[PDB]
């Protein structure tokens, strides 16, 4: 398999780790504060593949990439766990990706924007503003949820969509 050195970007009041954790650790914990920090080491299933990845979490108690400050240099893709009941962290994906395409090397990787707890109703961000930004980074938004654990799969599968895309389509 290969390895797909995942990052999480955004907020920590959207659910930064419940989405990681889940998609690895298959289970919800609730429980992961913003100031904890760990790397998930696990294989997925791609589009019904399947691709060796590591999601870190990234914790917060700081500004932005201070958090997960130590692990960019490899950022191989950043999964902007925004939600779409507080545009707070909104407002802080824009500037997450700004701080990203730095210390990577250009400001084109592969990330994508997602909405965490969608089932409810709710949404103190403009559904249209939230596709709207992911047009600006280039990503796609899926509107997912930690704990319906629905769409975090399309959520870190489209991510790597656009990673596990490139070792393809480079001719
Ligand atoms: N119902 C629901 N709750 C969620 C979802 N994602 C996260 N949560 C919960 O909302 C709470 C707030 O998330 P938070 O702890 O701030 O996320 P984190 O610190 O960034 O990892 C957490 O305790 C989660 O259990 C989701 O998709 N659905
Ligand atoms: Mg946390």
């Given amino acids: 398999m290969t390895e797909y050195k995942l990052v999480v970007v955004g907020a920590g009041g959207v659910g930064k780790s419940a989405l990681t954790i889940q998609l690895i650790q298959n289970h919800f914990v609730d429980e992961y504060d913003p100031t904890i920090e760990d790397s998930y080491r696990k294989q997925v299933v791609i589009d019904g593949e399947t691709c ?69 109703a709710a949404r103190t961000v403009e559904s249209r503003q939230a596709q709207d930004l992911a047009r600006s980074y280039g990503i796609p938004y899926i509107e997912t949820s930690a704990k319906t654990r629905q769409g975090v799969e399309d959520a870190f599968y489209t991510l790597v969509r656009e990673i596990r895309q490139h070792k393809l389509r480079k001719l």
Avoid at 60 to 80: N, V
Avoid at 91 to 104: A, G, L, N, T, W
């Fill in 52 to 120: 060796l990845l590591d999601i870190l979490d990234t914790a917060g108690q700081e500004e932005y990439s201070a958090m997960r400050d130590q692990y960019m240099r490899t950022g191989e893709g950043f999964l902007c766990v925004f939600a779409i009941n507080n545009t707070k962290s909104f407002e802080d994906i824009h500037q997450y990706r700004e701080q990203i395409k730095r210390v990577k090397d250009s400001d084109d990787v592969p990330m994508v924007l997602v909405g965490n707890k969608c089932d409810l």
